[PDB]
Symmetry: C2
Subunit: 96 residues, 2 copies
């Protein structure tokens, strides 16, 4: 938990970050700064993102693994990837 808190501090301290969400293996948002309705949705939505893309990646090759999933949108970029036992979600302005 502290790990995410250490990164959230610098993120929320810098300009560009819109909010950081953290979901556990159970699916519950252990921590989040986004909106109420925006967090609850992102929790499952994001969690399902890596879950869906994962089953697909397996088709890309026999021996593969997921460790990064970005999606540059029109509003902002939300970084999401599989962690030890949780799903990190970093939302902020676009970089591309």
């Amino acid at each position: 938990m502290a790990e995410v808190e250490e990164t959230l501090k610098r993120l929320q301290s810098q300009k560009g970050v819109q909010g950081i969400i953290v979901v556990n293996t159970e699916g519950i948002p252990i921590k989040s700064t986004m909106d109420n309705p925006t967090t609850t949705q992102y929790a499952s939505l994001m969690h399902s993102f890596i879950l869906k893309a994962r089953s697909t990646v397996r088709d890309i090759d026999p021996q593969n693994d997921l460790t990064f999933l970005r999606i540059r949108s029109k509003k902002n970029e939300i970084m999401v990837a599989p962690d030890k036992d949780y799903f990190l979600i970093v939302i902020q302005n676009p970089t591309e």
Copy 2:
């Protein structure tokens, strides 16, 4: 089409590139450098990939549109995004 072809030559000319594929909205790989079975599979799950995320993003909000899909793997990084009427896919070694 030519645009993608111009970028393919340079890519195939440089190291790192594993293989580039060019699929349309219908599902026909106008261009491909990978293997026979490797192309069909890639172009197969390709359309299924965008259709998967595009279906999820709809939950994030009403007004939006994906324009970048990157997935860092263990074998290589596969980046794909929506084009004029096709889906460009650049496969090569990892960058980050």
